Design a protein around this ligand. Structure first.
Ligand SMILES: Nc1nc2c(ncn2[C@@H]2O[C@H](COP(=O)(O)OP(=O)(O)OP(=O)(O)O)[C@@H](O)[C@H]2O)c(=O)[nH]1
Ligand SMILES: Nc1nc2c(ncn2[C@@H]2O[C@H](COP(=O)(O)OP(=O)(O)O)[C@@H](O)[C@H]2O)c(=O)[nH]1
Ligand SMILES: CC(C)(C)c1[nH]cnc1/C=c1\[nH]c(=O)/c(=C/c2ccccc2)[nH]c1=O
Ligand SMILES: [Mg+2]
Ligand SMILES: [Mg+2]
Lengths: 420, 424, 155
């Protein structure tokens, strides 16, 4: 039933606040926690993300974490800032200065127990916890360094629960040069400790805004508008009744435990109505992917698609069948019937028709190679390593993270080349 | 001579709903158990006139059985015989069998024993479940193992939903299907498979339904189940569960009869011309009417039962059979070529909210044909494609199962396919 | 040893301490254990005024460490545009090859420092220069799908 939501660092809290804004509107929750919606379907699965409080207020099951205090002021002055449980704000007074080691071993490690005290509290109020979703970036210090520490600690305490992340991958187009360090060290943790990771690539988000949406200077608000749309569609199947929970969806999406990094896509892409053939086509188009990878460069292990709005499911079945058969060589033949479809009658805000793509594709190795090449260029010159080793890190942690990263890349390629 | 029906997982529960909905109508029982008795095999009677199904509904999550508890039949069943956990098997046989399923198995057996204790001569169980779900596969195999220990001399019959991609919600269903069949083969006496794709095509081609729902599929499935179990609920052939085994399973591992049903007519054709005994009999050897997609012309028959319902004269059945004998259905050389015949003279019933037209005559043919091995090969092939890369295996190994059980199950299946080839 | 202190002052951006250390005779071309000079370090950590001070007093603009890195390699890697310009103005070898076969153009391309890429090209960066795996900067831009870099390199 219940999902516990944790958002860490500036990016994690910024895209997290936007998520809660979007799905509150979808469910008819106002900034004061009152239900003001029309459809009873808005409340059927309201308890997945909200606790029903005393005066019938609906309160997000959300925990807000950062080492920087100014992040909590920004979220709190948001439209739904005073809807979060005030005691669920856990903030230090230092900041990590984009230093993974500070988030993971020093400042963040001094704050993690406070976060776990609040996590424990929320989990105790749950009737049947599904698991956890985390929002964070991989390129800073708090979201990446402390976020992965939080992941491991939560994994130790609740090992029989699903851990999913929405993980923002850094890009020089939206950028310091130590971000490949932070992301590599974080990916190392995500490989071992999460069940599903949605790879939200700032390189892809910038490209979409700059080249498709023709936004000359994309802002974080421009990038996060695509993120809030992606997070809404990815969680639709859990907020509006299939008989499938987080675990059932992981079992169908993850054939091998390490390869749990998803390329998300969305159609239509708009800035601040398509037909079913147009939704199906754009959903699989490389230009609609939230990870900067070309799916035609790899092969799909598993694919899930979620259509939203009133449409012909007869037509959806037909369009989804042809995009497989006509592109048959891009879906691995040793996983039969590996593309699943669901439809939700309720469309997102501002649209009558939309669709969300979730791909477990071996082409995701292009994202990991891009990070690894940047990491290696820096690491070969040993630039700024004392910044990290001054917080107690050994240099072997860097080499081990690089190595595991390249191992993950080689695993993707092996299954990309596998035959039946 | 009582029979207890057990429904496991989403598919088993929802098909159970349809079956008991049809049963009540066929016997004149209202949704509250009241009736303004041959059916005492399937319904107990309280000292107040209430007729209660001898039925258990089990699921590892509550929302499907919760609909039974609040729906039209909320007062039909024993409330304590509607049993739910909180966390389902996540399409994982290992969870249904080894970890989550064992949290509730003892409660389920104690509640079944409550029903059993009310029986003066229990014949055994009818178990309804999907192949593809984690509960339908895993918890069913666990329940069957336990039932064979605690009811050593009772018969156990299966109605099992064979998976189809058109309505499939799990890529791992081929795994669960093989795992459950391996661990159930020893414990099941006779198993009626229903291919969701076959029912799908019937609803599309015969009933004119573009996108069949689970409700459409399940009312059609309940019609075939009803024709199969009518002999137990009315007065000649297949009078007790053991007789199912005697008539349909001469070879104990080959216990998967093919069901074929006719006629299936859209409710929009209320004034259809009525088909004769000969015409509906002929329709039983048309692959379009089979519950499992396969080709009996390329198989051999080991046994064949014809169960008629309605305005059916025995001499017309005998003439229709004579045609069938002398016109390419081959029996094995070690069984009688004859066809067993049951006639239930009650007109077949249709649910008022159903998609079927009323018919004066219907027939369900049950034939043990080696041709159904084709359906095993299709599943096994899908199994082999994934297991060769060990895809999804880690989910099962992490939930109380050893990886060697995969290949142990697949080797059983290979031997089962060998059994079909040797007989054929 | 004033050489060690000059190296640390140049790394930390201690502009006053750099001037005092040099006035006492500190070796402008001192090296640490791996062959980095004060100019390498000032260029790495973005300390432009110190880069210019060192160049004014005999720093070798093209000094290499044990790995073949020049100050321009490091400035192009970290992304200090003004420093890249100052080093090129004082004779930095635009096509210096390090022990991985990388030129400044390779490192600026890899790290997405597009303005620096344009500067290095204008000063004659070799678009055909191959790293030890045979990749040019254009190969890197196509292999990693960086369209903005690929059209810069094609001008
Ligand atoms: N004919 C029919 N098939 C169904 C129904 N529900 C599911 N099926 C199929 O059953 C398979 C999925 O198994 P389920 O019965 O839903 O799963 P379960 O037994 O509840 O097990 P878990 O949910 O994994 O714990 C798929 O092949 C479905 O198409 C139904 O109501 N009628
Ligand atoms: N898409 C997106 N990226 C962000 C946002 N805020 C920060 N980032 C990105 O996150 C990374 C920096 O991590 P940050 O969250 O700011 O530092 P932290 O507070 O220590 O976790 C950079 O790659 C930034 O481009 C945001 O609102 N949206
Ligand atoms: C049938 C269908 C399309 C619903 C499906 N089949 C397997 N996977 C999915 C979709 C999802 N699979 C997931 O794993 C998923 C993850 C999720 C959900 C909520 C919150 C965080 C992550 N969200 C999804 O929509
Ligand atoms: Mg920070
Ligand atoms: Mg279920």
């Amino acid at each position: 039933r219940e999902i516990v939501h944790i958002q860490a660092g500036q990016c994690g809290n910024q895209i997290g606040a936007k998520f809660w804004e979007v799905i509150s509107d979808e469910h008819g929750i106002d900034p004061s926690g009152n239900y003001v919606g029309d459809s009873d379907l808005q409340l059927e699965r309201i308890s997945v993300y909200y606790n029903e409080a005393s005066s019938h207020k609906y309160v997000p099951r959300a925990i807000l974490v950062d080492l920087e205090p100014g992040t909590m002021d920004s979220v709190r002055s948001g439209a739904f800032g005073h809807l979060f449980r005030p005691d669920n704000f856990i903030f230090g007074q230092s900041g990590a200065g984009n230093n993974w080691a500070k988030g993971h071993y020093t400042e963040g490690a001094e704050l993690v127990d406070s976060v776990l005290d609040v996590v424990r509290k929320e989990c105790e109020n749950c009737d049947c916890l599904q698991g956890f979703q985390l929002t964070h970036s991989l390129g800073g210090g708090t979201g990446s360094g402390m976020g992965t520490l939080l992941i491991s600690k939560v994994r130790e305490e609740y090992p029989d629960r699903i851990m999913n992340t929405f993980s923002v991958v850094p890009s020089p187009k939206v950028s310091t040069v130590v971000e490949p360090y932070n992301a590599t060290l974080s990916i190392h943790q995500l490989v071992e400790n999460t069940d599903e990771t949605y790879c939200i690539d700032n390189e892809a988000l910038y490209d979409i805004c700059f080249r498709t949406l023709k936004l000359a200077t994309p802002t974080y608000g421009d990038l996060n508008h695509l993120v809030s749309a992606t997070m809404s569609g990815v969680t639709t199947s859990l907020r509006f009744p299939l008989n499938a929970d987080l675990r059932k969806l992981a079992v169908n999406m993850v054939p091998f435990p390490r390869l749990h990094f998803f390329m998300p896509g969305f159609a239509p892409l708009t800035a601040r109505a398509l037909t079913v053939p147009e939704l199906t086509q754009q959903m699989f188009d490389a230009k609609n992917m939230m990870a900067a990878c070309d799916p035609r460069h790899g092969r799909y292990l598993t694919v899930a698609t979620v259509f939203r709005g009133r449409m012909s499911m007869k037509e959806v079945d037909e369009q989804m069948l042809a995009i497989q058969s006509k592109n048959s060589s891009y879906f691995v033949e040793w996983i039969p019937n590996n593309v699943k479809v669901a439809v939700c009658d309720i469309p997102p805000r501002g649209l009558k028709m939309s669709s969300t793509f979730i791909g477990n594709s071996t082409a995701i190795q292009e994202l990991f190679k891009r990070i690894s090449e940047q990491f290696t260029a820096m690491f070969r010159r040993k630039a700024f390593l004392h910044w990290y080793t001054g917080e107690g890190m050994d240099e072997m942690e860097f080499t081990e993270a690089e190595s595991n990263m390249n191992d993950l890349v080689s695993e993707y390629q092996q299954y990309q080349d596998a035959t039946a | 001579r009582e029979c207890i029906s057990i429904h496991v997982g989403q598919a088993g529960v929802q098909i159970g709903n349809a079956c008991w909905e049809l049963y009540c109508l066929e016997h004149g029982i209202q949704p509250d158990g009241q009736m303004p008795d041959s059916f005492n095999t399937f319904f107990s009677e309280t000292g107040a006139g209430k007729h209660v199904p001898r039925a258990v509904f089990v699921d590892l999550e509550p929302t499907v059985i919760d609909e039974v508890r609040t729906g039209t039949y909320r007062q039909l069943f024993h409330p304590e015989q509607l049993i739910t956990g909180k966390e389902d098997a996540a399409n994982n046989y290992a969870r249904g069998h080894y970890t989550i399923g064992k949290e509730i198995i003892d409660l389920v057996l104690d509640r079944i024993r409550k029903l059993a204790d009310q029986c003066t001569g229990l014949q055994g169980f009818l178990v309804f479940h999907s192949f593809g779900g984690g509960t339908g596969s895993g918890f069913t195999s666990l329940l069957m193992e336990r039932l064979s220990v605690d009811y050593g001399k009772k018969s156990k019959l299966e109605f099992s939903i064979y998976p189809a991609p058109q309505v499939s919600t799990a890529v791992v269903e081929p795994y669960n299907s093989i795992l459950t069949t391996h661990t159930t083969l020893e414990h099941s006496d006779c198993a009626f498979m229903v291919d969701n794709e076959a029912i799908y095509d019937i609803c599309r081609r015969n009933l004119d339904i573009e996108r069949p729902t689970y409700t459409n599929l399940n009312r059609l499935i309940s019609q075939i189940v009803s024709s199969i179990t009518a002999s137990l609920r009315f007065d000649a052939l297949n009078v007790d569960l053991t007789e199912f085994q005697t008539n349909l399973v001469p070879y104990p591992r080959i216990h998967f009869p093919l069901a074929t049903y006719a006629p299936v007519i859209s409710a929009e054709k209320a004034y259809h011309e009525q088909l004769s005994v000969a015409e509906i009999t002929n329709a039983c050897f048309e692959p379009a009417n089979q519950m499992v997609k396969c080709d009996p012309r390329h198989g051999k028959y080991m046994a064949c039962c014809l169960l008629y319902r309605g305005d059916v004269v025995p001499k017309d059945v005998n003439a229709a059979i004579a045609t069938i004998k002398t016109k390419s259905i081959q029996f094995v050389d070690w069984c009688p070529t004859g066809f067993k015949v049951g006639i239930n003279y009650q007109p077949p019933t249709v649910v008022p909210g159903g998609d079927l037209a009323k018919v004066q005559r219907a027939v369900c043919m049950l034939s043990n044909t080696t041709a159904i091995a084709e359906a095993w090969a299709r599943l096994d092939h899908k199994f082999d494609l994934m297991y060769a890369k060990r895809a999804f295996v880690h989910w099962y190994v992490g939930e109380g199962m050893e990886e060697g059980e995969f290949s142990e199950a697949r080797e059983d299946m290979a031997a089962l396919e060998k059994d079909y080839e040797e007989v054929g | 040893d004033l050489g060690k202190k000059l190296l640390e002052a140049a790394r930390a951006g201690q502009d006053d301490e750099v001037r005092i250390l040099m006035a006492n005779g500190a070796d402008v071309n001192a090296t640490d254990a791996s062959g980095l000079t004060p100019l390498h370090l000032a260029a790495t950590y973005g300390h432009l005024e110190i880069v210019e001070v060192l160049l004014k007093h005999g720093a070798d603009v093209n000094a290499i460490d044990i790995m073949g890195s020049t100050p321009l390699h490091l400035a192009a890697l970290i992304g200090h545009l003004e420093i890249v310009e100052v080093l090129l103005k004082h004779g930095a070898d635009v096509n210096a090859v390090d022990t991985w076969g990388d030129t400044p153009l390779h490192l600026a391309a890899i790290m997405g420092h597009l303005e620096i890429v344009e500067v290095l090209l204008k000063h004659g960066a070799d678009v055909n220069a191959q790293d030890k795996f045979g990749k040019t900067a254009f190969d890197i831009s196509i292999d990693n799908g960086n369209e903005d870099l690929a059209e810069i390199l094609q001008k």
